[PDB]
Amino acid sequence: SYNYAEALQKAIYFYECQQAGPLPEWNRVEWRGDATMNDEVLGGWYDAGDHVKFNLPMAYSAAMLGWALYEYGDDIEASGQRLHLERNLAFALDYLVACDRGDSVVYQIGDGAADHKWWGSAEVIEKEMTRPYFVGKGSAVVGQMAAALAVGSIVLKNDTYLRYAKKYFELADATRSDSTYTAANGFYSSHSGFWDELLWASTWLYLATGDRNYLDKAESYTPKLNRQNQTTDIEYQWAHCWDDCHYGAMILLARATGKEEYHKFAQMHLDWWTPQGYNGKRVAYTPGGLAHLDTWGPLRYATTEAFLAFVYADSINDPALKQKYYNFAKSQIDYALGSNPDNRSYVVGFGNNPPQRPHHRTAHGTWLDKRDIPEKHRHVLYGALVGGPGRDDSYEDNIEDYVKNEVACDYNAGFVGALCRLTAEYGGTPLANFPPPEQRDDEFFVEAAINQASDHFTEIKALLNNRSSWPARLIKDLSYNYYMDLTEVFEAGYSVDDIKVTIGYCESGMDVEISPITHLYDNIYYIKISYIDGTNICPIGQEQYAAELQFRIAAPQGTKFWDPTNDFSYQGLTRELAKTKYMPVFDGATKIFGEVPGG
Amino acid sequence: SYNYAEALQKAIYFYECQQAGPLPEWNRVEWRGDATMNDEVLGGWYDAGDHVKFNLPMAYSAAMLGWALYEYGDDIEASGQRLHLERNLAFALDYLVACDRGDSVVYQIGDGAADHKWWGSAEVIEKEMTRPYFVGKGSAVVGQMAAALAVGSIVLKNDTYLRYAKKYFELADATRSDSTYTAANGFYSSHSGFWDELLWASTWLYLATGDRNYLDKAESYTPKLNRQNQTTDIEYQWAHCWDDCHYGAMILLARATGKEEYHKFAQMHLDWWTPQGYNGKRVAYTPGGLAHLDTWGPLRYATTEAFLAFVYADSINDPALKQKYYNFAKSQIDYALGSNPDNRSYVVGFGNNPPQRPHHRTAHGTWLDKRDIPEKHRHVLYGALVGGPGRDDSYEDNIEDYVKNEVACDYNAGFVGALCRLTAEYGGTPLANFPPPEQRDDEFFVEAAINQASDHFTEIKALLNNRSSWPARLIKDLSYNYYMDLTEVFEAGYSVDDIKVTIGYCESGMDVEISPITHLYDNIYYIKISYIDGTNICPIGQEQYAAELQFRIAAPQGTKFWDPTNDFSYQGLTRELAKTKYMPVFDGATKIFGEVPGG
């Protein structure tokens, strides 16, 4: 119905957009550079359109990418995406290993409230704030980390991942408490508790090792799972998700053990998701056919359930059940890709009329801590599955809609597995030239205005701008030149010593020097304005993105010869601030913007 | 009793405090300089503790000082004050003549609202605002100008004053309207109308010329005077004052004509002011014995009536009446000098416990456009009679009490006449060394702090202050030096050209240059910070009284030899702003504050 291979290609590339520093050599995202290099644990993924590393959803996302490979890795080699998926997974798993602290782990980098208060690109956040880390031994977060590493060890044939999966599982299982998991409260609180994580982790360890001790542990956790309302059934009326993976664990155990209790659960749970429901109970559905679990990330939940349904349907033989679950799964993926009342993709950069304003700071590329400027995103967040429509299929592509236009690691994770299943079956050709280069705008440049003109002087207001975005970046050795023609000075009988440079305003905190008037060639002279620590010009807010200087170049009071109309840098200037190419900008000795006289 | 000669001496000196620029050579006030030199008409007096020239009360005050000389000039020669009173009067009269515009006069300089909104010294007000002038021919203001010049012509034997007195009287008499008197509205509105001024001016012209035509004009105006309530009697229940001089005119006409109608009026009016009253009717009296006409300027009204009562008493023969009026008069003057429930003088700089916080901008001497700082007045407004107490004798000396601590030309004017009469009777020795010099503060100086420090640089925050007050003044060619010892630079094998001067903050609007590092002697070098228009550093407000610059002097990054502790200008600096004598200030090439290495 769609080119699922292209969808898969893009959905994987999304994770490269999320990578924290240092970026791997193979990162394909021209607008991403090393970021948050002062973090206590390097690498891994930023969670959403923010810059926090939240280990619970991060590890969940990795576990799901691992599961995608575990089921379908061989079957996707034709799409050309297997190597891409594998190394993207390994990047996250390396971070999980790097979190080890022995009897505890680093479980978060960044403070949610502080991070979310600021809107700007990953590469410049250390200029705005200093990022904390958090250490603990929460059974849910540590258990999820163990599960991700366990499946990772299988699909990446990696003994180190298995060693760490065991370490973390032993810690989570010994601790049996979420009390030291607090830094993510209100963002990724542990809602369901930790027994589902221990189940999920022990299940994957059994699949990794064949050690029955893990299967005994797994089966021991099932009576501890939450019940459905006040009944005796295990809870089934929700989705497999970052908080609760018992759903997927029960499916894996149905297949691994063949035991009827797991099959009964899988069928009850999946039936509740399908249009026919489970004995009169059913997830809410939009009229447009999307199973709609909650206001937040409905596409995330539906596409994750599609992956579970595909895996379960593939694992059973009953034709009616297989067709029912397969049709459900495909219907949810197809909705996300464009089979909906608006006929539009909900995957950024894919398909017909995709979202163009995802709630994502670094893809947006602002310079002034605002969402509304720039009015269009500077970058394409290819592959990102957005939150999606409301319960009535309604949606508007709006950066301010932090629900419907949310994007996140966990939104993409199950989605990737489902796309693997569909590419396996239908094939499709990935895009050969992907990703294509972006149109860039000017990043470092001066805006200038004539602040005052007189018959004996020129006074310039000049703002040296850093609106970098490909990638956002800091340049220390910034300078710009203002060129003049002093022919009229010499003709009137005066010299360079008779021309005085003064300053009328220099912005606080911007260490600056102005050169003496310097000969270029002939009667062409210039001053250089140098910012000694240009990294303080940075796209982090209204005050920081440009440094303002007002400078005056003056012949003696009373003289009548001063003529700025032949001065190179005066060309086109008005009384209103405007970008000018005639006051070129330099990084050290290298010109990075503008033009020079002759030259 | 009191030393009335000293009180008179100081009461006259008050007028020198009020002189607008250009000051006469004989001005005795060390904290007054030429002020408001751009005014449309130069000289004259500021009205109160403000800087408006309001001609109606200015001319009334001049007329009253003239009247004091007319009655008592011979009788005060012993007090030594006659020549002081004469030249003080001539300064105001010269202004009145300079107001002539042919068919109209300048009757105001300054916009009352804008003037009063700002709190600062006369000499700097043109940095804060532009002062408009107003032209018209209102009969009250022009008539009072005429009267002032008519008595002035007599007592100063001056034909030019008589010529303008006639011309102004004719203009007032032709116009018979206050319609063109607009700019003083709500400050010195014409409340009584203009017939009383025509009466007062024509009476003085008769006394100056002996031309009975002026006497006939004077008598023609008396039926046009306002009535007392709804009766046929001329209004008598108020005081001779800036708005209405018919009271004094009637007294002068009683003496000049001997006619019963004027004596009947004089006695009705004066009896109403005495404790014995007129037919059971009387001005309010405080329990402490002050005749209290109104909330505003009660001492002004009572001391003016004291002068009228003295003049009328001296003009009649009835010992009972003479005693009644003399006792009234002396009681009111004595109350003002200290015969009151608090035993305290209401004349600044005189007697026991005088007011120290008069509502007077220039005597206060702020630099910040605030009344509360400085908390003590920097100057002594000797001789100013304040507004005075409430009807219950209540009073607190508070700069914020713009009623009780108001001071003005018209408050002092009648008061001077009354003091003339009392020193005529009782003698007294004026103060020999008056005025004594004031304690002065530093006026131009740098406040500096170490803003940032490291092993390769010093960064200074420097505020160049103008808190001048002796007198407040402007200096254009202001600079200050920062002296260093570069011994350690040379000791490291580096040169002067390896040291970098940069700026970290330059206050907006303060055109500034920093010299290259300049040799002084030995290994001592300096930078000069020069303000191109130092007059923008001025004591007119919170942002203007000091120019802020943050400058950094830096050795190359990575070097560790930099040594600020042998730098002359670094001595005593902390991280908090403080005045320093080691960053000396210059006016052109002349040092005006601080110290230099060596000397």
Ligand SMILES: OC[C@H]1O[C@@H](O[C@H]2[C@H](O)[C@@H](O)[C@H](O)O[C@@H]2CO)[C@H](O)[C@@H](O)[C@@H]1O
């Ligand atoms: O209580 C229903 C359901 O909650 C799941 O946690 C949710 C939480 O309710 C929601 O506010 C947050 O945004 O998402 C989490 C994860 O989906 C919980 O995992 C389930 O066990 C529970 O049945």
Ligand SMILES: OC[C@H]1O[C@@H](O[C@H]2[C@H](O)[C@@H](O)[C@H](O)O[C@@H]2CO)[C@H](O)[C@@H](O)[C@@H]1O
């Ligand atoms: O009506 C009383 C009295 O007013 C005199 O004008 C006052 C004015 O009322 C007051 O507001 C202002 O502060 O001072 C003026 C002058 O004292 C007016 O001169 C009288 O004729 C009249 O009797």
Ligand SMILES: [Br-]
């Ligand atoms: Br492409």
Ligand SMILES: [Br-]
């Ligand atoms: Br010239």
Ligand SMILES: [Br-]
């Ligand atoms: Br060029």
Ligand SMILES: [Br-]
């Ligand atoms: Br006019």
Ligand SMILES: [Br-]
């Ligand atoms: Br003295």
Ligand SMILES: [Br-]
């Ligand atoms: Br000295």
Ligand SMILES: [Ca+2]
């Ligand atoms: Ca859980």
Ligand SMILES: [Ca+2]
């Ligand atoms: Ca030129």
Ligand SMILES: [Ca+2]
């Ligand atoms: Ca009047």
Ligand SMILES: [Ca+2]
């Ligand atoms: Ca030194």
Ligand SMILES: [Cl-]
């Ligand atoms: Cl802990």
Ligand SMILES: [Cl-]
């Ligand atoms: Cl169905």
Ligand SMILES: [Cl-]
């Ligand atoms: Cl199937």
Ligand SMILES: [Cl-]
């Ligand atoms: Cl886009």
